Design a protein around this ligand. Structure first.
Ligand SMILES: Nc1ncnc2c1ncn2[C@@H]1O[C@H](COP(=O)(O)OP(=O)(O)O)[C@@H](O)[C@H]1O
Ligand SMILES: Nc1ncnc2c1ncn2[C@@H]1O[C@H](COP(=O)(O)OP(=O)(O)O)[C@@H](O)[C@H]1O
Ligand SMILES: O=P(O)(O)OC[C@H]1O[C@](O)(CO)[C@@H](O)[C@@H]1O
Ligand SMILES: O=P(O)(O)OC[C@H]1O[C@](O)(CO)[C@@H](O)[C@@H]1O
Lengths: 449, 449
């Protein structure tokens, strides 16, 4: 009934005329995601990628890699002997590392505001999983299991060459021995490995078993929305090689005037960029390539120069500046001094009046991200704010830095999937344009001064 | 480079100054969804619901129920004897009905603009499925299988009582005999039933096996985006009973002035409605109830009167009228005569300048629909256009009728899941308000007149 609108987010909240002595209380039970599987099955890759996605959509998530706890407690790896099932002392150390990680998991989910903790380890025995389940039960945490099953030697071999031999554990080995050492290591777990059995022993566990690198999936009893989103995400990512290209529309008339928003067309330079973009695409020599644009004129004119079929996404339209659309920043500062200052203090959360925030952008872009994960070669022609959000997802940048990422005109960001993330290459197409980047930029309210 | 903006959708397209004699060509290979399973497993329910969802998100889909073809060719059902595996003549009729349905499937996907055809039948043998696969291959159609497996007699019994005994096949039977007849019917298929075997015999088929009413899922090789969306949808719907309530914000100041859009607060009547809404909710006596609002003031003030926790969704915000926000329809007609007339001729596709269309609304609302499917009891407090879109989904209304559905103020639409769809009950809370509904509303351009 009597609400007030927050200045930054523009969210209507009930006015709480706190009493003489206001109370607070404070701070959807958190979830422990349990990775399961033999080594070199992509557990860490999945852990890191899923975590990159959850944080980007706004769900605070953290990976707890037992591997790093062991590397911290033992200093330098020598051989697979450390992992022999008959290595009583190492078995003890490994367990102690697991418990210390769970300790931090508990502190993360119950005291630091975390919502999803990804417990990244082999967890190959019912006994170990049972212990984690116990830990979850006693702390009131939900538990979801992700098991990667892969019995294709070609895949395991490739995985070892791609991330294991260059691992710090093998800093003193050459390819041949690292590979040999890792294979023996894997064999150590093979005898006691008890895969998840949703149809019998694990009927009541919430889980997804990822088979043959995402070829087949076995999903058992999803509990809530977050698990539902996780399952959807995991079933649409793949590891086939491809390349993702991101760039803004060629320079437009509004850019020349320093005006934000609008739907202006390409300037003479923007058009030169479009031709150059076509030449660049041509030279990349891609078998197939999907091209996506927003529904705003500038990105579409740019794609037209490619002479390739392209798809318009309303979700790729630049951030909506509300009542500030069509204005120069100078006019915003002069006409809306308060809004200008508010956005400068909280650029990620700030929402333009009757417009959007970077936070809204991210929600709007989720479907684009999901489809980008499913695709192969794709070129996305968009706008500044939109590109910053997309790049923040691929490069795992925080919400605080997202709105300040540098994404210049006439420049193509070439993203190639490698190891546990994305390698980024910048390629400026040598066509002049203005610069639209803007970096981040009390007394009388205390006595004497 | 030289594009023109479509007047209705506001989409930039390349100007095609067609030559003296313009050419056309015309009209993503279509998909045949194959239902699989014993009778009373929810195949028709899933077929109809999935179809309701696809059409609503814009993917033309049609169900081909072989059952209806048989009811058309044989006139009146007598008993399960028709379905005996030793009934040579009926086996022939059934096959002929299948082929005639496939005939229509082919005509639907290849000549009528259809994109997804749902082949609804038992298709319990590898032999029958192999025939459909052949049909798909020769027509260049993709094939996706949905198999519902349920071995819980309590579920089958309930299913029979809920949709079979009132089926037209049993128009001359009482509950007891219809039930008995259907059970014998099911037994007819049990000997030859060959479930999908993704791990062996059906390794190469794209499929989802729905187990224990959505408890567990087995998914094998999704081929494209549409199959991906279908899988996601199927894994989030359930059949637990619950109730969905939809209503608009109580009457607001803009409503009183006949102004569209804006973010005005509740009028004195709107506030009375809010109190009445609270009384109504209270009397419904719901164990638990989730309450969702948009981020606009009026829906939030309304929810505040409930004294229940509620969740704000930016996706529930009323359609954005762009440059027409805050205007009365009179002012729109006078200031933007052309826009006014264009919207009247194509209300579903028409997009306001720098604003939205009902088509955009639907895309914006997909996540709300998906989450509504996952939830139990939910009350959604929204706005006129938004409510029309939501209602169109639940009541399977077309895009053409969607923008004209009647959704009056101070009125609660109570939706209860029954049989193959949703029963709708209207409950006006007896509080006056204005009416915001507006129904649908050459010569000189031909010689003499
Ligand atoms: N579902 C999967 N099955 C098998 N390998 C995968 C899967 N997903 C990713 N990978 C691959 O696994 C590698 C990363 O493996 P890593 O995560 O270190 O394995 P692990 O943590 O299980 O010991 C990458 O080369 C990646 O392409
Ligand atoms: N996955 C499922 N498993 C079992 N029953 C289901 C499922 N989904 C829906 N139902 C139920 O099945 C009934 C509809 O069955 P129907 O579609 O006529 O079966 P069929 O077409 O297989 O002969 C409804 O009562 C519905 O609640
Ligand atoms: O988020 P920032 O730093 O204010 O830049 C936003 C602007 O960038 C632009 O794409 C201009 O370069 C505008 O259309 C948009 O409003
Ligand atoms: O789609 P319609 O029939 O133009 O009605 C749309 C309008 O309904 C309203 O909710 C007013 O009742 C406006 O805010 C919105 O613009």
């Amino acid at each position: 009934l009597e609400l007030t609108q927050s200045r930054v987010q523009k969210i209507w909240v009930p006015v709480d005329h706190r009493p003489s002595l206001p109370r607070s209380c404070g701070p959807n039970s958190p979830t422990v995601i349990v990775m399961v599987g033999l080594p070199a099955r992509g557990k860490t890759y999945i852990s890191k990628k899923l975590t990159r996605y959850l944080n980007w959509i706004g769900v605070p998530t953290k990976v707890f890699n037992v591997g790093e706890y062991r590397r911290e407690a033992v200093k330098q790896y020598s051989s697979y002997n450390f992992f022999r099932p008959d290595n009583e002392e190492a078995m003890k150390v490994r367990k102690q590392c697991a418990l210390a990680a769970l300790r931090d998991v508990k502190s993360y989910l119950a005291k630091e505001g975390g919502q999803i903790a990804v417990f990244d380890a082999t967890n190959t025995t019912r006994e170990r999983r049972h212990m984690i389940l116990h830990f979850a039960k006693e702390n009131d945490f939900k538990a979801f299991f992700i098991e990667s099953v892969c019995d294709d030697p070609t895949v395991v071999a490739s995985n070892i060459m791609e991330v294991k031999i260059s691992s710090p554990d093998y800093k003193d080995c050459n390819s041949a021995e690292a590979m040999d050492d890792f294979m023996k290591r894997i064999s150590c777990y093979e005898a006691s490995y008890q895969p998840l059995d949703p149809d019998k022993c694990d009927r009541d566990l919430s889980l997804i078993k990822v088979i043959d690198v995402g070829r087949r999936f076995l999903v058992n009893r999803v509990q809530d929305h977050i698990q539902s989103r996780i399952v959807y995400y995991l079933m649409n990512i793949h590891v086939q090689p491809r390349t993702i290209y991101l760039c803004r529309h060629g320079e437009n008339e509004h850019n020349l005037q320093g005006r934000i928003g609008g739907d202006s067309g390409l300037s003479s330079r923007g058009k030169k960029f479009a031709s150059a973009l076509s030449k660049f695409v041509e030279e990349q020599n891609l078998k197939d390539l999907r091209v996506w644009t927003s529904q705003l004129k500038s990105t579409i004119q740019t794609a037209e120069a490619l002479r390739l079929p392209y798809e318009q996404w309303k979700a790729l339209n630049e951030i909506d500046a509300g009542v500030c659309e069509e204005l120069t920043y100078e006019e915003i500062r002069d006409t809306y001094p308060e809004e200008y200052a508010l956005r400068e203090q909280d650029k990620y959360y700030y929402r333009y009046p009757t417009g959007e925030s970077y936070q809204d952008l991210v929600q709007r872009l989720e479907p684009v991200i999901m489809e980008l994960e499913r695709q192969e070669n794709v070129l996305v022609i968009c706008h500044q704010a939109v590109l910053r959000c997309l790049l923040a997802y691929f490069l795992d940048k925080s919400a605080e830095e997202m709105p300040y990422l540098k994404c210049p005109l006439h420049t193509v960001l070439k993203l190639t999937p490698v190891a546990y993330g994305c390698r980024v290459e910048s390629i400026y197409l040598n066509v002049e344009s203005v610069c639209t980047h803007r970096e981040r930029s009390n007394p009388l309210m205390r006595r004497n001064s």
